[PDB]
Design an enzyme around this catalytic site. Structure first.
Site, mmCIF file in Angstrom:
data_model
loop_
_atom_site.group_PDB
_atom_site.id
_atom_site.type_symbol
_atom_site.label_atom_id
_atom_site.label_comp_id
_atom_site.label_asym_id
_atom_site.label_seq_id
_atom_site.Cartn_x
_atom_site.Cartn_y
_atom_site.Cartn_z
ATOM 1 N N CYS A 167 -3.734 4.721 0.355
ATOM 2 C CA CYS A 167 -2.420 4.507 0.825
ATOM 3 C C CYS A 167 -1.376 5.344 0.302
ATOM 4 C CB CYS A 167 -2.466 2.968 0.522
ATOM 5 S SG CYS A 167 -0.646 2.242 0.573
ATOM 6 N N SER A 187 1.122 4.744 -1.116
ATOM 7 C CA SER A 187 1.690 4.438 -2.456
ATOM 8 C C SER A 187 0.784 4.798 -3.463
ATOM 9 C CB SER A 187 1.853 2.608 -2.612
ATOM 10 O OG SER A 187 2.524 2.284 -1.689
ATOM 11 N N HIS A 213 2.260 8.108 -4.149
ATOM 12 C CA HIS A 213 3.364 8.420 -4.777
ATOM 13 C C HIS A 213 3.108 8.082 -6.292
ATOM 14 C CE1 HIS A 213 5.561 7.617 -1.065
ATOM 15 N NE2 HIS A 213 5.876 6.178 -1.203
ATOM 16 N N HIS A 225 -5.386 0.429 -4.886
ATOM 17 C CA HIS A 225 -4.963 -0.894 -4.791
ATOM 18 C C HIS A 225 -5.488 -1.549 -3.551
ATOM 19 C CE1 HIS A 225 -1.933 1.251 -2.753
ATOM 20 N NE2 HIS A 225 -1.705 0.211 -2.172
ATOM 21 N N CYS A 284 -3.924 -4.095 1.676
ATOM 22 C CA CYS A 284 -2.481 -3.564 1.636
ATOM 23 C C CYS A 284 -2.052 -3.112 2.858
ATOM 24 C CB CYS A 284 -2.610 -2.213 0.710
ATOM 25 S SG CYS A 284 -0.725 -1.657 0.664
#
Ligand SMILES: NC(=O)C1=CN([C@@H]2O[C@H](COP(=O)(O)OP(=O)(O)OC[C@H]3O[C@@H](n4cnc5c(N)ncnc54)[C@H](O)[C@@H]3O)[C@@H](O)[C@H]2O)C=CC1
Ligand SMILES: NC(=O)C1=CN([C@@H]2O[C@H](COP(=O)(O)OP(=O)(O)OC[C@H]3O[C@@H](n4cnc5c(N)ncnc54)[C@H](O)[C@@H]3O)[C@@H](O)[C@H]2O)C=CC1
Ligand SMILES: Cc1ccc(CO)cc1
Ligand SMILES: Cc1ccc(CO)cc1
Ligand SMILES: [Zn+2]
Ligand SMILES: [Zn+2]
Ligand SMILES: [Zn+2]
Ligand SMILES: [Zn+2]
Lengths: 374, 374
Positions: A46, A48, A51, A67, A174
């Site tokens: 992902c 994220s 990030h 995640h 997700c």
């Protein structure tokens, strides 16, 4: 055979920002009371997770990130009631304690036990189940799925269908559920409406899928990377626009294209500027704009509140607005019944050990989701 | 007898920002096609009129301000079908053309014929009906009610109950309807909820009336002027707080008072800081915040978009979200049926020529609404 024992396994440890993951041996403690130890089967990459590497999303380091995943329960701690060894499970990065004022609210899903607002990078009891090089390693959102085994709190796992294909339904953990719910649950896209979706990665494609499921007449995909347009159209975009092709700002372009503004706009990137643009391009009296993108740590945006006083609605959401533990099993049951597709989001498949190639594919613009297999 | 003739009458003209109103002899042209000339009976002093004097709200000068009023139709232009001479009417500062995409939308009320987004200070045809010593005087929001006679477009006037008391129902033209609708229509306050209302003037008191009507359990009024608290409690505030009394930010006080955030917050002042404070104090997963206050010209606020990603909803509205021409008559019928009270908002009654005393009362903090009578 591993029950009640420390497991030694491979995990992708992030020791520092802006460095490759290190694939190395970790020790995974057995689960304590109300905890579940999961053998990972598949995990998506992902934005994220990226990030975290970039420091755009702050969480304590060193960390095992990851995640978006699915696995099989290896063992359960004392008092676990909702899963058993052998069960297929998806870890929940947004927990569902079932007890807090949010969990009891009909429209809340941001359970007060989350590790997203003020990340500690621990289990609920404030400790870690991971050791590497004799040091404690942080957890990520109560999940940590870039490891062959992980330990999660019971409120951070859902039992799914025993016949689920885990190399697909990991995305329900997700990116698919986030974008799909952002449209169907958070925005509540209406039949015959005009939608604008800023960002055509896996989450933005899932927003399109939800807009199409909700019966939108027009879905305008917006991306600076025109290589994202073909797949955006395959999953329901009626038009795609590249802001770089226009002299006027894109909110002005979209306001013209939609004869005075769109019904629903979605920010699915994570930039302050596009959050304000996406708000601006929804119709001034009755438009709705949803922030899905995760913004850069601690930064504020600037905006003219006359955008709202005319009548706009602005909102954001975690995980599509889904109550996670109630919703993820249902989402998997719907996937099994073919109510939505996940294959359009999967562009690459790699073994876990090639995680850094997976991040390279995302960073270069080439992938939507890479699924890592253990 | 005055039909089709120029009317010489008195109006309050604002020639310059930050100056008193000047009572002038003006000439009021007869109404052209689809226009209505109204003899004023009563007009309220709204803080938005004061925002024109302060330059907070930019509109072309010189101007006849006033937008919260009731009067009697003196004459109708060619083609008018919705009012006749002798009818009681309320001017509509937000029009309802019935033909634009907003007027046709079930929720929208900010008709595209409005003079609020980029004020021109004219009739729909781009001209003025008012002259003072040969000089054209601007209209304000298509209403201009600080005048013994005005001319409005047919889309900017509603016929009301022939028996209605104009010295009370003028507040339906703005402050009552704005605050009440903000609560009951825009926020959709729910039974048993906790609400916070920032600003306890006539619009904020009408938001409290709406919260109470909607069955809120707790209504926390917030004002820096503790003389506003008694009347707030009379119309339903359960608690009042003065941010100046506390050695910490009021959003923290309200989050603690509400055991982790309020259900619904309302900014009813017009300050950027209170807009962000109000958003922050609503519960981070499911809270809703409504901007009612008119912000200072061209100024942007600063905010952390994580306030919205957690699940908050942020919106604003003009005139409580009411479709004006449809709603006003029904609000007046509801008043006549004792469904709500207007006397709690009226603290002072003055003849029209004492307008400057009525603004001095508002500026001093003594009044809620002064009604000017003709
Ligand atoms: N709210 C939540 O619960 C969730 C939030 N997110 C966030 O959603 C966002 C998207 O995630 P992914 O789809 O995985 O990411 P991604 O990187 O695959 O997709 C983002 C897209 O935005 C495009 N883009 C970049 N800058 C642009 C600009 N200026 N204008 C227009 N397009 C631009 C990219 O070309 C890319 O196709 C990220 O910020 C991620 O952190 C991810 C999932 C859950
Ligand atoms: N959205 C819409 O359609 C409408 C908007 N408005 C706006 O609503 C607002 C309220 O109007 P009124 O009720 O007529 O004005 P008002 O001036 O009677 O009430 C405002 C109140 O805010 C309080 N105040 C000022 N600064 C404060 C601070 N820093 N903290 C807390 N309280 C503070 C004052 O003591 C006062 O009681 C104004 O901005 C007006 O322009 C009014 C009607 C229509
Ligand atoms: C704030 C936030 C962080 C991470 C995720 C996972 O994609 C979502 C939301
Ligand atoms: C923007 C705006 C201006 C004036 C009014 C009238 O109270 C409302 C809203
Ligand atoms: Zn909870
Ligand atoms: Zn994610
Ligand atoms: Zn007003
Ligand atoms: Zn209209």
């Amino acid at each position: 055979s591993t029950a009640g024992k420390v497991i030694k396994c491979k995990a992708a440890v992030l020791w520092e920002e802006k460095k490759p993951f290190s694939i190395e041996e970790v020790e995974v403690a057995p689960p304590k009371a109300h905890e579940v130890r999961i053998k990972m089967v598949a995990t998506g990459i992902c934005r994220s997770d990226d990030h975290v590497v970039s420091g755009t999303l702050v969480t304590p380091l060193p960390v095992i990130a990851g995640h978006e995943a699915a696995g099989i329960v290896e063992s359960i701690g004392e008092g676990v009631t909702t899963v058993r060894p052998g069960d297929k499970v998806i870890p929940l990065f947004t927990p569902q304690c079932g007890k807090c004022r949010v969990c009891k609210h009909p429209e809340g899903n941001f359970c007060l036990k989350n590790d997203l607002s003020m990340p500690r990078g621990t289990m609920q009891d404030g400790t870690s189940r991971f050791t590497c090089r004799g040091k404690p390693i942080h957890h990520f959102l109560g999940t940590s799925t870039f490891s062959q085994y992980t330990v999660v709190d019971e409120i951070s796992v859902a039992k799914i269908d025993a016949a689920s294909p885990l190399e697909k339904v990991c995305l329900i953990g997700c990116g698919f559920s986030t974008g799909y719910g952002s449209a169907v649950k958070v925005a509540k896209v209406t039949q015959g409406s005009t939608c604008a979706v800023f960002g055509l990665g896996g989450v933005g494609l899932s927003v399109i899928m939800g807009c199409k499921a909700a019966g939108a007449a027009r879905i305008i995909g917006v991306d600076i990377n025109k290589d994202k347009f073909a797949k955006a159209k395959e999953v329901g975009a009626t038009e795609c626009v590249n802001p770089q092709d226009y002299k006027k700002p894109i909110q002005e372009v979209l306001t013209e294209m939609s004869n005075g503004g769109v019904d629903f706009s979605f920010e699915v990137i994570g930039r302050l500027d596009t959050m304000v643009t996406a708000l601006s391009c929804c119709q001034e009296a009755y438009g709705v704009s949803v922030i899905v993108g995760v913004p850069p740590d601690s930064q504020n945006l600037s905006m003219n509140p006359m955008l709202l006083l005319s009548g706009r609605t602005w909102k954001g959401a975690i995980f599509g607005g889904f109550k996670s533990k109630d919703s993820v099993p249902k989402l998997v049951a719907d996937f099994m019944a073919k109510k939505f597709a996940l294959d359009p989001l999967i562009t690459h498949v790699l073994p876990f050990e090639k995680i850094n190639e997976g991040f390279d594919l995302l960073r270069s613009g080439e992938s939507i989701r890479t699924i890592l297999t253990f």
